[PDB]
Every structure is written in C-alpha cells, then in structure tokens.
C-alpha cells in the first residue's frame, strides 16, 4: 500500500514531438473540442470544433479579438505596433482600417490589381523559361514576383532585376521567421525564459536590418509625398498622419513603419509559401495536374494569357487552391487570440486575458465534416459534374473570420490564381531527374512552410507551337 508521488507538473503530450496543431488535434479524442492548459499564471484554451470556433471569431469576435503578449512578437512588431501582433485597441483599429482602405483602391483602374500582378508574373515566366530543361528551386523567383507586387502596393515601387536589396530582404525574412518561434507560435513551455540562449539576440539583429531598410524608404518618401496623390499604402498612412496633426500619436513613424512591415512581410511569405505548397501537391498528383492542363487548354488556350475573369472557366484550378488552403493552411492555428473581457465559449467561462487558440487544422481535418480529410481531393470543392464550385463543409476558414480575419485575402486569391494559371499554361512542371518528391509534411513556423525542393521546368510542347 504505497503512496503516490507528489505531482508538480503535468502536460498532455511530449513537447517538441510532432506538430503542435496535430498534437492538440489528437488530444480531442480524449478531452473534446475545447480544453485548457496552465503555465504559471498564463492560461490557454484550444478550440477544435467549428461551432466553438465561429463563436470565438464571429458571434463573440470583439470579446476575443485581443492578441497575447510574447517576447519575440514584441521585438518583431516594435512593441505591439502594426496590425497582426498589435492588441485590440486604438492603434490596431486605425491601421487595419487604413490598410483595408488601400486595398479597396486597387479595384479596377489605371492600376487594376490584376495588371500589377500580371506584369510581375510575366517577368517570372521569362526567367523560368531560361531554365528550360533544368531542375530548380522556384522559391526565389516567385519571391521576387510577389515582392515587387506588394512593394508596388506599398510604395508604387518595384525592384529591377538583380537588385541586391531582394537578397537582403530574403535574408532577414528567413532570419526573423527562424527565430520568431522554434516551431508554431503556440509554445506550451516557455523555453527561451528557462535556459540561456541567443534567440532574442538574433531576432533583434534581423529586425534591425529590416527596420533600417524600411526607414530608408520612408524617410526618402516624405519628399515624394503629395497630398493630391494618394495611390499606395504609404500615401494612405501619411495622409492620415497629415489630417490628424488623438490620432497623431497613433500614426507616428514607428507606427507607420510597423504597419508597412506587417504588409510587406505578410504579402511575400504567405503567398510564396502557398505557391510552393501547390506545386508540391501537383508533383504528388499528376492526374490532377494533367486535368489542370486540359482545363486551361479548353478555356484559355494559347491565344492569350490568363485573366481574373478566367476564374469562371478554370474551376478545377480554383478547386485546387481551395484544397491546398484546407490541407496545409498558412496559419493552421491562426494567430493567438486573447480574451479582451470575461466571456464564454460553449458556455464555459473564459476569464479576461486568457489566451485562446483556434485549431484550424482540427477544423480542416474533422472527419465528420470532411470526406477523407487527409487526402488531396480538389474534387470535393466541385459538384459531381465538374461544372461549378461548391462549399462542401461549414468547417473551412482558410482566412479566418471576424475582427481579425485576413486583410490581404483578395490580393492572395488573385496572386495565387494567376501564378498557377500562367505557369500551367507555359510549363510542364515535373519531378527532377533525381527521384526526389517534396516532403508534404511541412515545417510549422509562424507560417506553415514546405521544406525546399526542386522542380524540373520545361516549356510546354503546345505553348511552343502557338508562337509561329
Ligand atoms: C494564402 C495566403 C493567406 C492566407 C491563407 C491568410 C490567412 C490568414 C489567417 C488565417 C489569419 C488569422 C487571423 C487571426 O489571427 O484570427 C490572417 C491574418 C492576417 N493576414 Fe493573412 N492570409 C494570407 C495572406 C495574406 C496577405 C497577402 C496579406 C497582405 C497584407 C495578409 C495580411 C494579414 C494580416 C495583417 C493579418 C492580421 C490581421 C489582424 O491581426 O487583424 N495575409 N491571415
Ligand atoms: C514574420 C513576418 C515574415 C518575415 C518578415 O521579415 C517579418 C514579418 C512581418 C513583419 N514585419 C509580418 C508577419 C510576417 C509573417 C506573416 C505574418 C505573421 C502574418 C500572416 C500570417 C499568416 C497569414 N496571414 C498573415 C501577419 C503578420 C506577418
């Protein structure tokens, strides 16, 4: 009759074993779609069912629109400025509205968002075409294309080919994403505070390069700014600073710096990442990819290059994108939410300041809401006749919802569709000469990245004949 050992701590699973978003998901078979963990004083709630998720994001969105405070996120956002890592309050509301207003501009005009995107995609396809017959990592080329686009939206500026600044930006992007969090942003145990490490040291130095670069651009642009011409995001932010000079403290330089940084960062890493994910799946699914070549041929052909209007006709492509955004969400656990006030979820009590995580991965893989969810099946987003798109499930939130939903969704959907439409029209994208296929397991960082891989690019037999 022995006594049981006193218990000091208890965690449901091993830390740093498997992907957090899948460990939390597997836990639901034991504890249900909502449960909590406690770290000292901090408490975290994980939510794995869509009804509970739509409560947190929508029905009670404003109750749960805060952002928790993390040492790394402070450095990366210059102490909780910007949009994504700014808590709910005066600053976030202002900057999210102005960022949303800038995008609203790019409704068709002399800078119809499509035209910006298409100009930089056309450059890209000319690069890739020089690698005709070779196996390459497509990361940096697509990085350049989207970097020019968001740079145009932010400053009406693009980078000429070969600009060494692009290599500088790529370098500090990888540096921050590396040290922003070991894996997912949700970290059960606070490892950086426990043991000696250089993580915040490294993070600071990449942020110093990033802030110094954006500071050059901004100080430069004060001399280009004319109140009669408000055509990009920096114009928008300065105009606002101009008009208010309680809002002048909200639109300081450091504030404007961070918002632009948030946009410049999100616009490149998310879309570049989703493109790589899509090619990876197509290399694993030639049957899909063949069907995609047929689709484009019988609806766009080679008389001309694809267009946003072509979303009507290239449905299997729209479907494919939907299915990638489901299988491999950019933010499989969104960005951590925080309870701004005493509230409830599923009529369980949630106290002020409590961290709340939506397990978007659990929503996209719940077997009751999805037919064979771990499968790549773009067909699930099409009626059985292949003729129009459908919403097969209610647990599908690739861009979130509510007060914190994605602000660059429109941009993302158009960049994604045009990149994949131009590439399939022009190139056979096949497995390299080594038998290697990309690992579809992914790498959970602040964004769900795919390990780098190589694709063999060949100009299409058809696209060639159409040049005579
Ligand atoms: C396919 C690409 C993308 C996907 C799937 C995506 C999805 C998401 C998701 C799921 C969130 C979570 C919001 C939350 O924390 O609840 C989010 C937030 C956000 N996204 Fe995206 N996004 C994409 C691309 C972009 C782009 C191109 C931009 C360009 C500016 C952008 C800007 C943002 C910002 C600023 C936030 C934070 C908003 C806030 O905290 O209020 N994203 N996005
Ligand atoms: C971390 C990163 C990328 C590296 C860059 O050097 C610095 C950076 C940002 C800045 N400045 C904003 C972040 C973005 C990553 C994507 C983020 C987290 C993002 C997001 C993440 C997932 C989906 N949609 C948007 C909102 C803020 C963006």
From Swiss-Prot:
Residues binding heme: 406
Keyword annotations from UniProtKB, A to Z: Congenital adrenal hyperplasia, Disease variant, Endoplasmic reticulum, Heme, Iron, Lipid metabolism, Lyase, Membrane, Metal-binding, Microsome, Monooxygenase, Oxidoreductase, Phosphoprotein, Steroidogenesis
A GO BP entry: glucocorticoid biosynthetic process
GO function term, MF aspect, one: steroid 17-alpha-monooxygenase activity
Phenotypic consequence of residue 6 to L: In AH5; 38% 17alpha-hydroxylase activity and 33% 17,20-lyase activity
Annotated SUPFAM superfamilies: Cytochrome P450
Residues that, per the record, bind substrate: 173
Requisite cofactors: heme
Subcellular localization, as worded in the UniProt entry: Endoplasmic reticulum membrane; Microsome membrane
A GO-annotated cellular component: axon
Pathway: Steroid hormone biosynthesis; Steroid biosynthesis; glucocorticoid biosynthesis
Regulation: Regulated predominantly by intracellular cAMP levels. The 17,20-lyase activity is stimulated by cytochrome b5, which acts as an allosteric effector increasing the Vmax of the lyase activity.
Modification after translation: Phosphorylation is necessary for 17,20-lyase, but not for 17-alpha-hydroxylase activity.
Enzyme Commission number(s): 1.14.14.19, 1.14.14.32
Catalysis: reaction(s): a C21-steroid + reduced [NADPH--hemoprotein reductase] + O2 = a 17alpha-hydroxy-C21-steroid + oxidized [NADPH--hemoprotein reductase] + H2O + H(+); progesterone + reduced [NADPH--hemoprotein reductase] + O2 = 17alpha-hydroxyprogesterone + oxidized [NADPH--hemoprotein reductase] + H2O + H(+); pregnenolone + reduced [NADPH--hemoprotein reductase] + O2 = 17alpha-hydroxypregnenolone + oxidized [NADPH--hemoprotein reductase] + H2O + H(+); 17alpha-hydroxyprogesterone + reduced [NADPH--hemoprotein reductase] + O2 = androst-4-ene-3,17-dione + acetate + oxidized [NADPH--hemoprotein reductase] + H2O + 2 H(+)
PANTHER family per UniProt: STEROID 17-ALPHA-HYDROXYLASE/17,20 LYASE, STEROID 17-ALPHA-HYDROXYLASE_17,20 LYASE
Annotated disorder: Adrenal hyperplasia 5: A form of congenital adrenal hyperplasia, a common recessive disease due to defective synthesis of cortisol. Congenital adrenal hyperplasia is characterized by androgen excess leading to ambiguous genitalia in affected females, rapid somatic growth during childhood in both sexes with premature closure of the epiphyses and short adult stature.
Family classification: Belongs to the cytochrome P450 family.
Described function: A cytochrome P450 monooxygenase involved in corticoid and androgen biosynthesis. Catalyzes 17-alpha hydroxylation of C21 steroids, which is common for both pathways. A second oxidative step, required only for androgen synthesis, involves an acyl-carbon cleavage. The 17-alpha hydroxy intermediates, as part of adrenal glucocorticoids biosynthesis pathway, are precursors of cortisol.
Name the UniProt record assigns to this protein: Steroid 17-alpha-hydroxylase/17,20 lyase
Lineage: Eukaryota, Metazoa, Chordata, Craniata, Vertebrata
């Amino acid at each position: 009759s022995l006594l049981s050992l006193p218990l000091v701590g208890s965690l449901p699973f091993l830390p740093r074993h498997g992907h957090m978003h899948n460990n939390f998901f597997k836990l639901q078979k034991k504890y249900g779609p909502i449960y909590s963990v406690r770290m000292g004083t901090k408490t975290t709630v994980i939510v794995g069912h869509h009804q509970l998720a739509k409560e947190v994001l929508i029905k009670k969105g404003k109750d749960f629109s805060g952002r928790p405070q993390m040492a790394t996120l402070d450095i990366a956002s210059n102490n909780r400025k910007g949009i994504a890592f700014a808590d709910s309050g005066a600053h976030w509301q202002l900057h999210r509205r102005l960022a949303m207003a800038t995008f609203a501009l790019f409704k068709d005009g002399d800078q119809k968002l499509e035209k910006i995107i298409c100009q930089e995609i056309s450059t890209l396809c000319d690069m890739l075409a020089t690698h005709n017959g070779q196996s390459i990592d497509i990361s940096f080329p697509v990085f350049v294309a989207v970097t020019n686009v968001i740079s145009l939206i932010c400053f009406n500026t693009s980078y000429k080919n070969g600009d060494p600044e692009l290599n500088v930006i790529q370098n500090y992007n990888e540096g921050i994403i590396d040290n922003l969090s070991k894996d997912s942003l949700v970290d059960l145990v606070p490892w950086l505070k426990i043991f000696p490490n250089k993580t915040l040291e490294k993070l600071k130095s990449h942020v110093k390069i990033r802030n110094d670069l954006l500071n050059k651009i901004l100080e430069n642009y004060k001399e280009k700014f004319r109140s009669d011409s408000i055509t990009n995001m920096l114009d928008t932010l300065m105009q606002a600073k101009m008009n208010s000079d309680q809002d002048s403290e909200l639109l300081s330089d450091n504030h404007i710096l961070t918002t632009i940084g948030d946009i410049f960062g999100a616009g490149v890493e998310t879309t570049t990442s989703v493109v790589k994910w899509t090619l990876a799946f197509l290399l694993h699914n030639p049957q899909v990819k063949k069907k995609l070549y047929e689709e484009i041929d019988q609806n766009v052909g080679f008389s001309r290059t694809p267009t946003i209007s072509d979303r009507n006709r290239l449905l299997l492509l729209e479907a494919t994108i939907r299915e990638v955004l489901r299988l491999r969400p950019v933010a499989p656990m969104l960005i951590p939410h925080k309870a701004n006030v005493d509230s409830s979820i599923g009529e369980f009590a949630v106290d002020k300041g409590t961290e709340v995580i939506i397990n978007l991965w659990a929503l996209h893989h719940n077997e009751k809401e999805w037919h064979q969810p771990d499968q790549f099946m773009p067909e699930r987003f099409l009626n059985p006749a292949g003729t129009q798109l459908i919403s097969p499930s209610v647990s599908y939130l690739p861009f979130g919802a509510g007060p914190r939903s994605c602000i660059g969704e429109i941009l993302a959907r158009q960049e994604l569709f045009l990149i994949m439409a131009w590439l399939l029209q022009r190139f056979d994208l096949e497995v390299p000469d080594d038998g290697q296929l990309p690992s579809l397991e992914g790498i959970p960082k602040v964004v769900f990245l795919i390990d780098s891989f190589k694709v063999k690019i060949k100009v299409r037999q058809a696209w060639r004949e159409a040049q005579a």
